[PDB]
């Protein structure tokens, strides 16, 4: 079994506080959710609480909304979870392969059993006939982030694909950087799978509840 | 001479309104300009308003801060000053040599003699080790935008360069694409030339005054 | 157990004839293989005939030199095995992260028992003092390939990384498009992890041998 | 009036050699050329030898039959022209909007009054339906070049602009490296204006005449 740090319990909560620009629309979401963060587990309930109901896609805000909960087998090191309490924070960019554009960062900390995720995001060039501003996404695919160590960062390359109505894919490349607020023992080259589903949502998806499974590994040959 | 436009005087101020997130800090800034929109002259004050002193260089803000100040030759349609009174938005992608990337957005408008400008700006993976984060930038070459048109948009590109302390430089490509709020008569291929300097600044860059000159045309052959 | 096609037995062989140029230098190379189509297992000795030594890391050229050799599944359609007897053709492009960049294009047919390859790869702007032309690197990392179908061509991105000497990672894009001669049964959405390694070679790399073992599959969660 | 250099004459000849692959097609073409070096003009009259007729836009070769006949103004250094007799190596990536990517490789030399060019061309993804497989494109656009010098060697990017049968822009970024065969005078951030067109042809581009006027110059501000 893998370590489990004494500021994570088996059973945690969190908040999520986003607000962002997309195609130049501001607005803002609240979610709470909760999970077991040593069993790769998670859901959360998010409100959208200022512009909505968004003129986009839902699904480009999906994976923005927790890498604690991701499942670590014993021998490798765990970045995100050795960071705390202090915490960690990361940046993402999210190029779709019609030129979209998406710049993320994010700040997460810790008070007792419930994490806080301050998470900003910025999209642009989203072309006004493309499937995200006609919202014809039909959720991620799961999906595989390879990650490594650089200059006690950790770095993820994720090639990620939104499915489209009547068949079809739209490509998203995810680069991200991982920076814990105190240095943590780095791990090696491993990858991390995911699926993230929207479990049920209300018909503008102003209230969107979504859930994830995370689970590390290396590679299986 | 070129045609002006009655809601555009030959001599302007304007007001610009700025707030951004940059490797995860967020700033804002306000300014006040003026110029000459049909000579393609203008100079504008800008102050740090949160966030200050700025932990980034001041150059990658730049030219962020007003393309109606663009001398326009008679022959050429001038998209932007064709859009008001209505106005007119843009998104820009900076993409810089060492991975960062910057994605910006901006909202402009006017009241009687007066520019009004909102614009928001998000930066991610600038090395901590880099020109921005370690201020050796030393401003901007003069550059020329490519511009066409396509699908009611005026699409532009341009290879920007930042001067380096001890010579050389750091290389830049912005991707912009301005949107008119309205139909409006749509040029053809041609080009920007601009050349952009911080005329004065206190020692913290929490005050700072630009000057910059634009002036579109065809190619030279 | 996976449908066998007949015109594949279940151990072949094949030739494969690389010409190129990296950096300007051009060169020639061919090899002898063998293995075992549906257990995704196979072994390729490589003798530089034209260009030897040659002046950069022979890492670059090692994933040119085969997929027939991949065990897929008994549920997902393998795209390249119902290409033949007519075959296949693919084209690749590696992105560097230090810049430099590869086109590559292949011809895929059979004779009998014996796969043929034919195989280009055209590199530029490897840096002078980077690990391809110092010689740094140590080898691929394990790796999954990212497939799915779209206008009857299968498209493979994948997420590569070289080690280099003294740890640490030097990486590489890989986005690759494979096109059956005669229309054939799509697959769907999938992944192939490969492991590829150089197990022998003399002092410069102009005889060398390499083996690789192929697995498709669905994603793990 | 700027130097002229004694080994390269007020009015040259040229031949080049051109060998090279696109979406898998080889081909073949050589040219005979002469201009004015120290005026920038110049022409070539091309034969396609092998692989003819081309099943591909011919404007995607255009740029690659001769940069010694550019005119230099007087205060920048002739990277180019400084290299000889020896001579020079250049790079070049063309990347196209809907994601074709070709590799060039340029090796030249001089035999008194002629200069010598071989040329390498790599080209792959070209989409099946995309303009340049179907013949579409109408020639390029005037364009510029921006010019800087790097670890002794001249690094060049240009926006370049492909016209479309029905009006619109079919788009490619051109990225080159040269080389000088010998260390020699760096010249400052510049640019180079360029035109060229195809003067004539004759059905299916067998037989093709090219004329190209190159200028180099300081920014116009």
Same mark, same amino acid.
């Given at each position: 079994?893998?370590?489990?740090? /004494? ?6 909560? %969190?908040? #999520?506080?986003? $607000? +962002? ?7 803002? *979401? ?78 997460? /900390? ?6 806080? %995720?301050? #998470?900003?995001? $910025? +999209? ?7 499937? *995200? ?89």
């Amino acid at each position: 079994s893998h370590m489990m740090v /004494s500021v994570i319990a088996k059973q945690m909560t %969190y908040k #999520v506080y986003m $607000s +962002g620009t997309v195609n130049g629309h501001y607005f803002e *979401v609240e979610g709470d959710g909760k999970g077991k963060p040593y069993e790769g587990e998670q859901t959360v309930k998010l409100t959208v609480t200022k512009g909505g109901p968004l003129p986009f896609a839902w699904d480009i805000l999906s994976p923005l909304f927790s890498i604690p909960f991701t499942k670590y087998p014993e021998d490798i090191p765990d970045y995100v979870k050795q960071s705390f309490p202090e915490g960690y924070t990361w940046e993402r960019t999210m190029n779709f392969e019609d030129g979209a554009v998406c710049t993320v960062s994010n700040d997460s /900390s810790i008070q007792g059993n419930c994490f806080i %995720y301050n #998470v900003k995001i $910025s +999209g642009v060039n989203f072309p006004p006939n493309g499937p *995200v501003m006609q919202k014809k996404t039909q959720g991620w695919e799961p999906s595989t982030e390879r990650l490594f160590a650089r200059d006690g960062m950790l770095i993820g390359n994720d090639y990620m694909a939104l499915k489209l109505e009547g068949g079809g894919h739209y490509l998203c490349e995810f680069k991200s950087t991982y920076k814990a607020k105190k240095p943590v023992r780095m791990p090696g080259y491993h990858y991390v799978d995911r699926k993230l589903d929207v479990t049920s949502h209300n018909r503008d998806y102003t209230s969107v509840e979504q859930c994830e499974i995370a689970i590390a590994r290396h590679s299986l040959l």
